[PDB]
Write an enzyme that holds these catalytic residues in place. Structure first.
Site, short mmCIF file in Angstrom:
data_model
loop_
_atom_site.label_atom_id
_atom_site.label_comp_id
_atom_site.label_asym_id
_atom_site.label_seq_id
_atom_site.Cartn_x
_atom_site.Cartn_y
_atom_site.Cartn_z
N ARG A 1 -4.56 -8.31 -1.36
CA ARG A 1 -3.50 -8.80 -2.25
C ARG A 1 -2.48 -7.86 -2.50
O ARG A 1 -1.36 -8.07 -2.52
CB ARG A 1 -4.04 -9.32 -3.73
CG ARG A 1 -5.04 -10.80 -3.48
CD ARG A 1 -4.16 -11.67 -2.65
NE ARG A 1 -5.02 -12.77 -2.28
CZ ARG A 1 -5.99 -13.03 -1.64
NH1 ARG A 1 -6.35 -12.22 -0.72
NH2 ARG A 1 -6.57 -14.08 -1.50
N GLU B 1 -0.53 -7.48 0.52
CA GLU B 1 0.28 -8.44 0.78
C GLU B 1 1.63 -8.35 -0.22
O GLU B 1 2.61 -8.67 0.27
CB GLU B 1 -0.20 -9.76 0.25
CG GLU B 1 0.45 -11.00 0.52
CD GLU B 1 -0.55 -12.19 0.40
OE1 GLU B 1 -0.94 -12.62 1.45
OE2 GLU B 1 -0.41 -12.88 -0.46
N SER C 1 8.22 8.81 -5.71
CA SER C 1 7.09 9.81 -5.07
C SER C 1 5.66 8.87 -5.25
O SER C 1 5.48 8.18 -6.20
CB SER C 1 7.38 10.95 -6.04
OG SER C 1 6.22 12.03 -5.48
CL LIG Z 1 -3.44 -14.43 -4.15
CL LIG Z 2 -6.24 -17.23 -2.80
CL LIG Z 3 5.98 11.87 -2.48
#
Ligand SMILES: [Cl-]
Ligand SMILES: [Cl-]
Ligand SMILES: [Cl-]
Ligand SMILES: [Cl-]
Ligand SMILES: [Cl-]
Ligand SMILES: [Cl-]
Ligand SMILES: [Cl-]
Ligand SMILES: [Cl-]
Ligand SMILES: [Cl-]
Ligand SMILES: [Cl-]
Lengths: 155, 155, 155, 155, 155, 155, 155, 155, 155, 155
Positions: I95, I98, I121
């Site tokens: 996730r 994603e 950073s």
């Molecule tokens: Cl999700």
């Molecule tokens: Cl899901």
């Molecule tokens: Cl960095």
């Protein structure tokens, strides 16, 4: 029948089966005789790609002098896959991969022409290797792929 | 004879050949008749995987109503490779890849047993697809791979 | 002849053969002497890429003091492939990979021009490395690739 | 001298050069004559892997009937790399990759024994292909790799 | 000199060298001191990327108390390659990979402009890292790459 | 400042800048002259890896005769990445990749020893290439990487 | 029936079909109506994954106002594969990939337990998506995979 | 509850569960009886893809005669992922991957039409495999995917 | 301070730390108390991603009952990288991957707009995960990324 | 609502929207004003990762002076994925990729500890970037990830 989730258990048996095969100087033709099954099937089962029926598991384990765990592992449904990485580097195996590279489009085209939309099965499938003499001198391999036609029909 | 360094020129020819094939309702069996070559060879050449001799190239271009640039391009040695990426996703082609995955170890083992150290050639090679009836009802494909045995001999 | 399904058995032998080679302070030329085979071939066999004939296998095992299991493994057909991952990182090997990257297209063009449609074999193949003096001071390597021409002939 | 940052400009030039070569039925040996350079170098340059000196660029452009923008593009240092993806699929090119897979370990081992720690250069390098007859009837390719030895010495 | 065919022996040696280094609370500066070689060379050799001459190999092995297989293994030519997989994930190493990602085109462009067609060698090569002060407070690393220019000349 | 989301716009600009560079027969040193910035920075910006301040962008665009779009595109923050695929095939660029392969582990070790836990920055970073003479005859490249040390401190 | 060797022609048809669908404000529900086939099949055919029979091909082309080169392309067997690269990035498609990642081992285990050695076919296969009310408030998707069991039996 | 960072601890537990499962000849249905959970869930947990609640973990550990470390390990959240490499080679598992390859685009298109912008959950998800008879002879698997529709709504 | 060249030494320590954590029923919240560091930092250090200050290393090893070889290893700078292969398969980790796929372009666009040319950073960086109540019922995670802005300034 | 099968249509729209933003000298903050939606959402939608409701689509199309095809395309559900290849090379985006590489294991561990078995949703998700001053000088980005906890419950 019982199945295996990973390939590690069957890889160890194959290393044990091959060790006995070399030390006893046995051939795959000798191992498959008196099992009732084809050479290609029995050899694949020893290489961890098929499950042997229980009589064949005892017939092959007797010839190699295998344990009772070996007879049980030979009967299990494996996690199939003989080429680590999908693409081989060994020349003997690669030639068959190269055949797929040149004639891959051709096989699809001719299957859809002679049979129709669908596939040629790799499960309802028989494989056979035959050694024949080349009329131009030398030897040739005649590998036969016999797969059932499964059509893709609209639903 | 002339060779091509990339596949793009033959991919354009193949897309033109396929367009003509659909519009004229032609089969690969019809395109290969009167060429003297096998169906698998002529089809592979049309799909950009082989060079046709000038007589065969002129027979197929006449049936498809193609230009003279098509017969010359059909005679050039292509940059072979019909599967983009090496591993197919199309089910019809993949089934043959799966056959390689399960019986790769089996094919190498039996080739070295029946023939010896070496390879089964993909260049000195013949391909054949034959339709046969399945005894349980239905059809089956009998794909035949006939390759010359090339030994690995010490030097 | 007996074949190996994986590389693990010959990779272990190579570590044992190389360990003995260093401990005996021997060269590949000294190990190859009296075998009748070429330096490149015997060295490849010791590194697990070829099968040695039994007389040659006994000469090298005698020089290194290896057991009789070692002579049997040296005669088995291996699963070839010396670069793990296909692409090397070691500079010495990569330079040969780089040669293929620049002159790959060039080799194909000139093979199809001087020979025709087909391949230059890697099985009917001989390898030789020769040290020559460089006229601007220093030394040069002259590696020779001698392969049989296999034509692709129509079927 | 001017360098190119990408390969697209030289790939278009190579595609036009090959088109002119096929339509006028010219040879790479014919294209390289009167340049003073070796066949392998000029062929690589036309295939976008090397920069031609202006006399050679003008001699080849006259034979193919190319514009002045082709003569300039033939003199620029290219972004080298002729096998897309590093690993070829074409059988003719793959055979050279297969040689690397089997004899890669052997080449490194023998380079360190005959020369020492270091590399055989691919920049201070010459390539040659020669056609010779096979004692069993037929032809063979004798490819020569001539590279300078660069040692790895402590600093 | 003796070369190693795989990286496994030197990876194990590096694991022992690093373990001993932690336990003796030694620095790479202390291990390389009194050997006559540069810090970058000795550190690289200890990490399995270079061969140490025996005087240097014995001084460093004495400081860490390494076995006698280690002193011989430290003197052998290794199979080079310190980043498994080619592309690192560790931030410290990646920053150097990122420098190559942005200035790769710039390095090629400026080398062909200032030097000409060819390469800047990685074998005839010296490496040094120096700590300097940042005018805005803090520290900076001044890594120096000193490589011989090898020209690509027509042949 | 304005940012670009993909690399396509700057890849087109780089091809026009390089084509214009050849037609004016200009060098990267000549293009960067009178800009107040270092050669490596201006060259990288033209190769699509950096944003130029508008005064520098107009000085270089006037020399090459670029459209008004190029002047705005040279000032926009690009999507950085000069080596397509991460690993180069061109020999000139690869030598720098090979430097990373051999001394990657070594650089991490010495950075943590001389500086501590952290990185050597690729953003707070200066690059310089200088040509020097080899006492053994020939020329050498002295590429300097100047990055500020950013420590990893607990949070 | 005619089949296609590459995916490029059907991807152009698919983008034209989708362009017409959005431009005419049509639903997939409307396009599949009056074809006699299921929604999942016709939608797959429009996305280039199935061949439509000619009656269905004209009803869908009439609603979108497509030419006769579209009805011919809609009836051809395509080169299947809807996820470029095999693994998706779009979350909606990925969720189905994740189901395979968690329950892949479970599906194999339970297929071999409830059915035996073999596969659940993807060609003798029907797909159905149904919207049902979730008792916890909200909606749920009920995707059904109906595949024929093909056993792997010894040969 | 306790989480695992790698899969190795659960991979060993799965190997012990499978070994005991074979020797007592128990089924996954027998292991799941009296736990209150679905067959697909319990099988997934034993194959290392789910955490079992303590009552279910003890009922299954008693049936196989496992130690207390096994009951504790069965209750920990694993590192999910049952297909090593993401793409399977085993035919039984691959068929489900192929279903994803052909109908992936179709699933996304129809999900957005019938449900809207969002996903079909793989976490709020139930899996069921059901054996039903094929009217043309044989058996069929009816795998049902029941996922909650989660919409993507603006924020 | 001491650095590690590979991740294997710390991967074994992480496996021992997790075993002790499960066996003693300890939390990461209990292990991080009294070190002065944030929960995310110490947890990452136990999972092999950070070096612990020497006092903190003793307290955590004392709570888990580890030998002193572990706290000595706990103080070493590791080879960072917690996702083997770069892309995770576990849904919980995916996730976050994603999120990067959808908002990656958005993060770059807004960073260059609000801050300018440069980076945010990952070394001058703090991580925090906070549990908060969802106003619509349920719970939410509020992960906070606090990174220093490093500008790209011309040189 | 209408969904897209590929990313090309939204990639073209993104190139026109970004051109209009620069030509009108607008910020993402100005474009998101008067839409009622968050900066991160509207910015992602313009970059082809989200669907805008038609009121928001019309205010943005009016500010940039876009046609009606832009208003329709901004409302369509896209094929999500903003990093081509999954792994970025641009430093600005990579830093967020690097954050996931180091703290990926830590996020999973702490999510399962504070919440339990499950995921932190990427669909029920909020993203926000805030600029704060660094106490020792400079600026910092405070990126906030707000995801709903979705538990994995047994079935
Ligand atoms: Cl999700
Ligand atoms: Cl899901
Ligand atoms: Cl960095
Ligand atoms: Cl099948
Ligand atoms: Cl061959
Ligand atoms: Cl060959
Ligand atoms: Cl070189
Ligand atoms: Cl070099
Ligand atoms: Cl940085
Ligand atoms: Cl199937």
């Amino acid at each position: 029948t019982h199945s295996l989730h990973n390939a590690a258990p069957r890889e160890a048996l194959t290393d044990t089966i091959m060790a006995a095969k070399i030390r006893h100087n046995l051939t795959f033709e000798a191992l498959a005789q008196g099992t009732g099954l084809s050479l290609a099937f029995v050899t694949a089962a020893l290489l961890g790609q098929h499950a042997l029926p229980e009589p064949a598991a005892r017939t092959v384990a007797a010839k190699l002098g295998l344990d009772e765990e070996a007879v049980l592992l030979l009967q299990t449904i494996p996690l199939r896959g003989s080429i680590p990485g999908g693409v081989p580097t060994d020349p003997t195996i690669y030639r068959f991969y190269e055949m797929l590279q040149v004639y891959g489009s051709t096989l699809k085209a001719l299957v859809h022409e002679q049979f129709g939309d669908g596939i040629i099965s790799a499960i309802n499938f028989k494989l056979d290797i035959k050694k024949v003499a080349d009329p131009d001198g030398g030897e040739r391999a005649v590998i036969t792929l016999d797969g059932k036609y499964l059509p893709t029909k609209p639903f």
